[PDB]
Design an enzyme around this catalytic site. Structure first.
Site, PDB file in Angstrom:
ATOM      1  CD  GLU A   1     -49.328   4.405  54.408  1.00  0.00           C
ATOM      2  OE1 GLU A   1     -50.301   4.086  55.123  1.00  0.00           O
ATOM      3  OE2 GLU A   1     -49.427   4.615  53.181  1.00  0.00           O
TER       4      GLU A   1
ATOM      5  CE  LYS B   1     -49.825   0.983  52.610  1.00  0.00           C
ATOM      6  NZ  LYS B   1     -51.302   0.786  52.463  1.00  0.00           N
TER       7      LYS B   1
END
Lengths: 353, 350, 350, 361
Positions: free
Chosen positions: B187, B229
């Site tokens: 992420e 992500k």
């Protein structure tokens, strides 16, 4: 963290359209850019004097093959000399190529040079005045370029320096080309020489391509306006272990899936030292590989398309038709292969990697 | 340039299988991993005391919604505390999640820390003893992890150091996770803060992701056993120029196509500050974008899935059904969105 | 390309002043930071129970050696436990060290961890919560820190990954230390294990140090406020070719001259597996090397200063004086060595 | 992580010996390698036509000054054209230079080219066929080379790309040079253009030099066989804040101490847009800076050594002596400055005080 657009929307569109035409469904590239020195051995192999006229006749033989090759050839890479030669009727070769639906390519690198402090490794030269050369080639009919970098698998190679330097030079080359409306074909060839196995080639290919695309990113290269010409993933020529075409295809597609952004318009494989038939079977297998492939997977063959033609020609004018027929046959075979529709008859694991 | 296999064919299969289950067609992730501190403001907004029992009750409310959410939820990220809590029937929450067809995730980073010599930039910590923690989390029901790096668009940010350092730590985290059978969700969040435009966000996103994947390669990360992500590509939250959802979709898909290798199993978008409806409409547009997308494009939403449920609950046990109904509504909307089937009722320019 | 000052002039002055005091002419470092586990083997060799008391007594034995060591010891590295122990008279060890003119150092790393995908290579952990720990240590008497990264010379090592990762973590550790007024000792140790020759160690040492300083630069490290603790350049332990101390010296100095910026305040050599005498003779030769050396070249020895003392002690309280006498003799020997005055009785080829 | 020696001990010794001769105590470099398009602007300021003979004559004037310059000049950089020209007595210029105890240098780069995707940034070309060119130049009398990379301080520059690319090409150039017995002078020039202050220039210089040496290390460059030609650390030409020579010296020496390995044989500063006197004064202050400096700190000046001479010459063959006298005076000044023994107090024409700065066009 700030953008300073290297290309306008119109420039990007031009490059993207060129790239897509070259690798349109069923099409590949004829690599006929051999220099005087290269074609010398080939002409000698058939006892033919290496003169400009003989080179012109040979290139004309390939370029003027019948219309059966039209849907097969999306691009033709020429050597400088050939770009300015004409067919018997006076038509410039670039015009002949375009009239048959092909895009004209031009080799622009100036060969490899040794990298000091390495174990026989090299980088490639040719950036000096490249922008001016590209603008001239564009005006003279070329829309894409060829630049070859060479890496070798050995005990200590490819080294970090070799990988980094070749990736960087390819990025500079790509950047200059795009500034002049020329689609650059990025070619980081990893030689098949050695006794290394399939997984070692796959490993090295994966690391080289990751470095290549990081470099293109650092140099602000427009990927949609580029093509990739990599080696297929195969065992070394001296490898004792044997592999199936299915395994070669899986290792190749897996390596590409792990490194090549889907934005890259197409992958045009070099055949290395594979036979004409071998290169077609492997390309077909690559296309039949049960994995998702977001880019065209086609060919950019030289000897893999000319071998038989050259032999059939023998340097005798009376063998023209027989020679062209051998070339047309390989063009048709590879056209099917890059669609995964190839068969010897003619028309009609995964986690371990 | 020599291979020393980090993973066996068996370990790869396990990771790839987990990654695929999380982002299977029509499925997304419920990010319910807020810490006591990050959820405090949410509970006080509804005049509810921030206790362990109230947090447990709220998590139970979301995790035990009816079977309608099963086809919508491929994964649920939990905070350490919640991974060890149980529903009123005594069932451990990880068991509740699995019984509904979901994979359990666990937040493992230890927050951001300031990077000296930068203009307020950060990196993320949490690698110490991470291997042992992952081994334990795996035994306790978790199959994937969450680690958040934060980057900001500003006059001089994100800097070369911030991009390089965050990309590197994400690779370290991913490497440790995979050694323990845990699928790491990478992420690299680029905050929407600022008045920059869509093109700026796209440029920065492209540069950050290129750095992230080069780092993953250098660290020998098995991409098929990972998920991404990222932030969607949108104009700054304060940008004066306005864009359409289709433009946001084109910018986002283009950025990803230019940086994310096809081998990456899936992309689970964070919603940032987007409203519940906004997050669903953008995700739908992304899936409707006419460009080829070789990876699942789905969601990993927190507030974008809980906003209405939290308000409907209001901290009152009598509003259980009502609250769960709001969550189900968003789960359904986003399940359709990640398939390009949601209806609330020149790519060369990128 | 814009500066965002990580340190103020006052902060820089403090770090530079500390660094200079540690490596003042004739001074070196006593590395007595062994952990309970890393000292176990040595206490075993002398049949002494590994208890906090014996560990305390042993450290007390070294720290309270007579005043002859004062001009020889500029710094003393302690393990966490010892930093909070006291001498029999009630004086906190840090106070004992400072009263003798020494600066107190503290080990802050949390050991090595394996790098997946490599041939047995590692990186080092310990960054989590490091800032808070440094602030606490500073408050409790420490002014410098120790963090050890380990690299190995082999057929395929140290790899590009190992070099890059270890240099990066060393830079992060350095940055955090300087934000808290702690002088970081950058320690990129290349093990002497193997049959490689002198020129191979020199080559690897040069490449590693070049990577280390680029990383320190990328992370905005204040070099004047740091020290370097590298391995001396020597042939592997299993190498069959023999070399003189003069060749080891020339190789060591040449490697440092080609990679270490003049701004680095000092180089405190680790002794690896060298004997007490060997380590002193090599340091002496290094200081007598004809080439110009813009940084102090001294010692940061553990075993090279404690070997004979530990053996003389044998865990017997009655051997106190005999044990201290051995330590004092090595402290005196190395003080002369770091000045090129110790005596037991073509550069183009590099 | 395996060594494959780029150079032998003999090759190393040859390169090291050359670099040390160029920056021997009290010696500096005369940068007389201006091209035709560059020297033309200079000859135009004196109504002198830009012909090959005029350029030849001008170079002869500098190269044949009296023996007082001998101890001052360790090296002379020439342009391709000049390397093959001869003095009025038939002696090839390389011979004239060597006869006065100087080492001959040659410019080998082919100019800057734009870096696409940047805000007016460049990299430099000239690597093609460089090896063969160096081998030929070596046989023709040259022992060191010049290659100039250019960076600019701006709101977004120098960018990560510009820094990395320029450092990389400098390393390739240095590698090829060393393979042919030529000492490469690494020149990463950061332009003084802009209104930035002293600390910003110091910051940028430190980041650029760190990148340069990491690249040289990656390319296996033998540092003892190289020289560094950087900009002194100074505030932008348009900066409002004023600084003393001591501050400029401190910032410059500090930046170098934090990035340049001791193994580097010497630093030959470019003057940028500084006047003749300013260049000498700053160089002097640098050599007097209290900090430890493990490398020779000298000059490699072009206009900073020729300004007064060019004006005194005026293209008139009758002003030869007067012209050479001005050059000798500046050479003696900088010879003392590179030893920290320079103290003006005296003549110093008005031309030696005139700013030689030219905005980057």
């Amino acid at each position: 963290p700030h953008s300073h657009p290297a290309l306008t929307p119109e420039q990007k569109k031009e490059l993207s359209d060129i790239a897509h035409r070259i690798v349109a469904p069923g099409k590949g590239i004829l690599a006929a850019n051999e220099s005087t020195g290269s074609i010398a051995k080939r002409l000698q192999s058939i006892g033919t004097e290496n003169t400009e006229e003989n080179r012109r006749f040979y290139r004309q033989l390939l370029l003027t093959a019948d219309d059966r090759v039209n849907p097969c050839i999306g691009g033709v890479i020429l050597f400088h000399e050939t770009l300015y030669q004409k067919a018997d009727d006076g038509r410039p070769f670039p015009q002949v190529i375009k009239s048959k639906g092909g895009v004209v390519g031009i080799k622009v690198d100036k060969g490899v040079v040794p990298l000091a402090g390495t174990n026989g490794e090299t980088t490639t030269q040719g950036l000096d005045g490249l922008s001016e050369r590209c603008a001239q080639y564009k005006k003279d009919g070329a829309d894409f370029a060829k630049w070859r970098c060479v890496l070798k698998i050995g005990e200590h190679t490819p080294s970090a320096l070799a990988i980094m330097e070749n990736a960087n030079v390819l990025a500079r080359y790509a950047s200059i080309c795009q500034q002049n409306g020329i689609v650059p074909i990025v070619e980081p060839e990893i030689l098949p020489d050695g006794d290394h196995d399939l997984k070692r080639c796959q490993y090295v290919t994966e690391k080289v391509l990751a470095a290549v695309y990081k470099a293109l990113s650092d140099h602000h290269i427009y990927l949609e306006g580029t093509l990739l010409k990599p080696n297929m993933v195969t065992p070394g020529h001296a490898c004792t272990q044997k592999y199936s075409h299915e395994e070669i295809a899986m290792a190749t597609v897996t390596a590409l899936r792990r490194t090549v952004p889907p934005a890259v318009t197409g992958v045009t494989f070099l055949s290395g030292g594979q036979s004409e038939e071998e290169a077609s079977i492997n390309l077909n297998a690559i296309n039949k590989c049960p994995l998702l492939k977001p880019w065209a997977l086609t060919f950019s063959y030289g000897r893999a398309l000319q071998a038989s033609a050259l032999k059939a020609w023998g340097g005798k004018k009376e063998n023209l038709k027989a020679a062209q027929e051998e070339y047309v046959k390989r063009a048709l075979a590879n056209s099917l292969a890059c669609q995964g529709k190839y068969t010897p008859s003619g028309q009609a694991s995964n986690h371990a990697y």
